[PDB]
Amino acid sequence: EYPTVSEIPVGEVRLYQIADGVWSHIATQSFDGAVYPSNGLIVRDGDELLLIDTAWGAKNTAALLAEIEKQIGLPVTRAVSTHFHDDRVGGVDVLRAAGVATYASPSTRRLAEVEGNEIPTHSLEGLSSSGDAVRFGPVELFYPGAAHSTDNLVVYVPSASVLYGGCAIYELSRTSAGNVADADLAEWPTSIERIQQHYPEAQFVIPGHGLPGGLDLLKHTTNVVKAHTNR
């Protein structure tokens, strides 16, 4: 029942309810003639919502806000971008114009600026060293170490045992490495180990792209990364 890349036209956004007060948002983009899906997270924080990542571009992110309004009807007050790539910060300027406070680690904000990408306004403190965790409203933010990017964060929702891995975690149907231009291949399996150690109780694991599953997605990603390393 999870929406698949084939059921979402680019420009549209679907929401998928995972648990009481926890949703993923799913959008699509074209790249080099193919269509890719992308996931983010929505978490209810009292009578407000916390958004995790944009919907990969301004147009998708405006549609995301419209779909949240229609389907949930609570205001998005804060948003966190989990690394500096466009599928995480592309749309930050739309969020800001709507009055959403946008957040990222100082590492992410610096890398976005170097890349010419949109820059979240606020800086998250306490995430500079691998293994660092901080609470942010209804979620925990965790820096596992360098992996898909040097700045990547993961997000845990304790009320629902939901682990959002972002692009540090691959879906099971991905058997070859994706965009690894900014990755630390050497550190990636160790960083995954840190996620496993910190959230062994996670019941629902969401990759940055594609279908959710369980904690098997962590070992799966290590397998893919190590195979790429040996390519």
Ligand SMILES: SC[C@H]1SC[C@@H]2Nc3ccccc3N21
């Ligand atoms: S992980 C950041 C995203 S934004 C642009 C780049 N190219 C690409 C192609 C397919 C899937 C994902 C991607 N990435």
Ligand SMILES: [Zn+2]
């Ligand atoms: Zn990325």
Ligand SMILES: [Zn+2]
């Ligand atoms: Zn502000």
Ligand SMILES: [Zn+2]
């Ligand atoms: Zn990505």
